[PDB]
A paper describes a structure:
We define here a previously unrecognized class of RBS-directed antibodies that are abundant in circulating human memory B cells (Bmem).
We determined the structure of S8V1-172 complexed with the A/Sydney/05/1997(H3N2) HA head domain and compared it with K03.28. With reference to the HA head, S8V1-172 is pitched toward the 190-helix, contacting it with its heavy chain. As a result, the HCDR3s of each antibody emanate from different points above the RBS but converge to closely related contacts for the E-G-W motif. As in K03.28, E104 has polar contacts with Y98 and H183, G105 has a positive phi angle, and W-106 mimics contacts by the sialic acid acetamido group. Rather than evading K133a, antibodies K03.28 and S8V1-172 engage it using analogous HCDR3 contacts. The structure of S8V1-172 with an H3 HA, which lacks 133a, suggests that it could engage K133a in an H1 HA with HCDR3 residues D99 and H108.
Numbering used by the authors:
A (entry chain Z): 1 to 224
B (entry chain B): 41 to 308, 327 to 330
C (entry chain Y): 1 to 211
């Protein structure tokens, strides 16, 4: 099955050039038409450009002078290059394939669409997160159900990935969306509801991964 | 005496069954051009083509136009019987902008434009027998893409073939990827081909790419029917003889009007 | 350039009901429009192509329609796993997308289970105290969380975030964080968050007492 994976940075300071590489597994890259799409935060979807089977490229007129889509046979990778990066370019960028038939008028398809490298454009410094336990209590024991979690505080930029017990605990986990406090850093909390009987016996690890800062943190949430 | 001359200027709708393909040619009605959908499964004793007729669908080029035109002419019927071929692994019902039916994209009603499905186009091999006693006429086509990117985007094959074989004839067409002149916003073309499956014979489709599959067979009917290109009005009257210049009395022994006569008609004589 | 405008901006329909989403275009487009479903934090998924034709996997409940200027998509029997923002896209000469319509499946009223978490001794050593109040699996989404520090109301010093609608139980979860300095935290004793919600006939007040 043809599968795609976006590889790219997490932060690009303004005036630089964004470089995003889309690696495709299980298919032929010279065949099939591809296209890049970005999603600005809370703004919607926008078309960046597309490279076709003929190798000819077509870019959004608003972003022609800065966009360049290249491919590297012997690597099976799709390269997006966005020069003169401004903060409006802060979005989640995606590489997708199209079922286009130029000439016959057959424009129908998006199929494989990617994962989405979040790119933040700012002059800030990538700062790792600080994980603090949200410990339960005998008060949290309301006769059966209790709650515990982790507070992932003060990091930049988005995102962070929080798992519980190396992914072995998923039932009831609620990784909350991040908030941007007044300091300019992000902060979120990931909680999970467990039976209060299993508090003093089951160990609870929260695994926080902040790729833009190359930070992995493992923390034990335990009662006092 | 002798020559008749004395043309009327109108073709009588009696006693012979006359069909006025206004704006529509026989080959166009055979394929299913949207402006000819009112001629489906209709019979005739004499079919009259007009000079005002045109084609308003995908651009087609019939290699042997005269024979296929003469085949359907003699049968005097456009009766189409649908068959269910097992086109497994491909997608059917391909439409384009040129063939616009009811203001929507469409195609020839009697043809099936097989294209890619899940980016995979396998080597199709289907067979249908002529268990019935009437000879079957299968009308198929071959698509000629504009560029190699089109050939890859529709069929996912660098090149294709279409081979239609029987006990007596094997027809192989190789696509010619080219940029023909623009007609109805399209630079590609399609080549129509026919194959008659006699009783006790089988039809073999070996297509590896660019197949315009048929949706069924037609009925070769033994009949005295034929066709005649004429621009004369079809009036209401009774006349046994018919010429492109109008109905003619069959009382006199010979005709100098034209070498094109249908039915009981005085034989032709030259004007000078 | 062609511009697509979807209506309405947000649809709220109970399970089993029928969804109708429009995508009026500026100029004539013909059957050259496609509908996409973007689950939260996920990929847009091609639903309908060529205005009407359905793609692989796309069930029969999805049914698009239209031809020129006005195009519509009809989701029959809305299931809880249909909560997403739906987009329409045109593709000829250029590529243009729509504004998006958020469909929100509506379950029965569910009261939130409230939990409170005192600050960690680690964070207290740093100099900041973050108190967290958790409201787990509730609907409707509308809720008021009021913080109280020694019978004193709390505004400005507390933020909150709500999870997007769960694609199965159609419930929401809310997390409110009250931030104070270490000096201000140890100067008081009682810390509570007062939750007022429709399913709560009386406001709930979860609290702790040290600090
Ligand atoms: C054979 O073909 C001729 C030529 O196409 C037909 O005459 C034309 O028929 C059309 C039918 O749509 C007439 O329509 C025009 O429609 C547009 C709508 O956008 C409008 O702009 C025009 O005012 C008009 O209403 C057209 O006037 C007419 N005459 C022409 C083209 O000179 C004829 O009807 C066809 N006959 C058969 C039997 O198919
Ligand atoms: C390409 O289109 C043809 C024509 O629709 C498909 O073949 C089958 O044709 C029959 C008769 O035209 C269709 O039955 C019809 O169903 C409608 C809807 O209930 C009904 O209103 C009509 O009276 C008629 O009974 C049949 O649905 C259709 N088959 C399918 C699967 O649509 C052919 O299958 C199409 N090729 C594809 C989809 O690859
Ligand atoms: C035309 O359609 C026919 C109908 O199926 C196809 O016939 C048969 O196709 C197979 C390939 O699947 C041919 O290859 C044979 O394969 C076996 C191994 O599986 C090999 O041992 C044989 O020596 C042979 O190579 C087969 O010859 C052919 N005919 C028969 C009677 O089975 C055909 O492939 C289609 N295409 C063409 C160009 O004929």
């Amino acid at each position: 099955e043809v599968q795609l994976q976006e590889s790219g940075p997490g932060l690009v300071k303004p005036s630089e050039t964004l470089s995003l590489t889309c690696t495709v597994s299980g298919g032929s890259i010279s065949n099939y038409h591809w296209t890049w799409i970005r999603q600005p935060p809370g703004k919607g979807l926008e078309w960046i450009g597309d490279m076709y089977n003929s190798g000819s490229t077509k870019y959004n007129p608003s972003l022609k002078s800065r966009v360049t889509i290249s491919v590297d046979r012997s690597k099976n990778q799709l390269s997006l290059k966005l020069s003169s990066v401004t903060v409006a370019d802060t979005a989640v960028y995606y590489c997708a394939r199209d079922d286009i038939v130029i000439g016959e008028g057959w424009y129908h398809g998006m199929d494989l669409w990617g994962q989405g490298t979040t790119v933040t454009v700012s002059g800030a410094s990538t700062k790792g997160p600080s994980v603090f336990p949200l410990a339960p209590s005998s008060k949290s024991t309301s006769g059966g159900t209790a709650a515990l979690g982790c507070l992932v505080k003060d990091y930049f930029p988005e995102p962070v990935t929080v798992s519980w017990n190396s992914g072995a605990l998923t039932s009831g986990v609620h990784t909350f969306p991040a908030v941007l406090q007044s300091s300019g850093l992000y902060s979120l909390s990931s909680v999970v509801t467990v039976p209060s009987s299993s508090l003093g016996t089951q160990t609870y690890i929260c695994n926080v991964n902040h790729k833009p800062s190359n930070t992995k943190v493992d923390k034990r949430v335990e009662p006092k | 005496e002798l020559v008749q001359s004395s043309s009327t200027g109108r073709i009588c709708d009696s006693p012979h069954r006359i069909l006025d393909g206004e704006n529509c040619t026989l080959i166009d009605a055979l394929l299913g051009d949207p402006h000819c959908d009112g001629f489906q499964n209709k019979e005739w004793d004499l079919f009259v083509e007009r000079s005002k007729a045109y084609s308003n669908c995908y651009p087609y080029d019939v290699p042997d136009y005269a024979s296929l035109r003469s085949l359907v002419a003699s049968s005097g019927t456009l009766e189409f019987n649908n068959e269910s071929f097992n086109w497994t692994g491909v997608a059917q019902n391909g439409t384009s902008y040129a063939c616009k039916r009811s203001s929507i994209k469409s195609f020839f009603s009697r043809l099936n434009w097989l294209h890619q499905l899940k980016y995979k186009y396998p080597a199709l091999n289907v067979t249908m027998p002529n268990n019935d006693k009437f000879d079957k006429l299968y009308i198929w086509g071959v698509h000629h893409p504009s560029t190699d990117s089109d050939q890859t985007s529709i069929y996912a094959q660098a090149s294709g073939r279409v081979t239609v074989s029987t006990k007596r004839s094997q027809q192989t067409v190789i696509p010619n990827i080219g940029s023909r002149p623009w007609v109805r916003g399209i630079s590609s073309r399609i080549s129509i081909h026919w194959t008659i499956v006699k009783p006790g014979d089988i039809l073999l489709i070996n297509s590896t790419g660019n197949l315009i599959a048929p949706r069924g067979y037609f009925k070769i009917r033994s009949g005295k029917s034929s066709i005649m290109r004429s621009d004369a009005p079809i009036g209401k009257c009774n006349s046994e003889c018919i010429t492109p210049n109008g109905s003619i009395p069959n009382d006199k022994p010979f005709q100098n009007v034209n070498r094109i006569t249908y039915g009981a008609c005085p034989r032709y004589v030259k004007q000078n | 350039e062609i511009v697509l405008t979807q209506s309405p901006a947000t649809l709220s329909l109970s399970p089993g009901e029928r969804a109708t989403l429009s995508c009026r275009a500026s100029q004539s487009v013909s059957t050259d429009l496609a509908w996409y479903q973007q689950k939260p934090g996920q990929a847009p998924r091609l639903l309908i192509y060529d205005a009407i034709s359905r793609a692989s996997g796309i069930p029969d409940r999805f049914s698009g329609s239209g031809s020129g200027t006005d195009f519509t998509l009809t989701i029959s029997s809305l299931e809880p796993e249909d909560f997403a923002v739906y987009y329409c896209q045109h593709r000829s000469t250029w590529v243009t997308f729509g504004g998006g319509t958020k469909v929100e499946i509506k379950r029965t009223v569910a009261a939130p289970s409230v939990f409170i978490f005192p600050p960690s001794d680690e964070q207290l050593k740093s100099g900041t105290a973050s108190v967290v109040c958790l409201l787990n699996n509730f609907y409707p989404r509308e809720a008021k969380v009021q913080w109280k520090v020694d019978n004193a109301l709390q505004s400005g010093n507390s933020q909150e975030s709500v999870t997007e609608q769960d694609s199965k139980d159609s419930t929401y979860s809310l997390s409110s964080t009250l931030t104070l300095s270490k000096a201000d935290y140890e100067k008081h004793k009682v810390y509570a968050c007062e939750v007022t919600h429709q399913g709560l006939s009386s406001p709930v007040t979860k609290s702790f007492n040290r600090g």
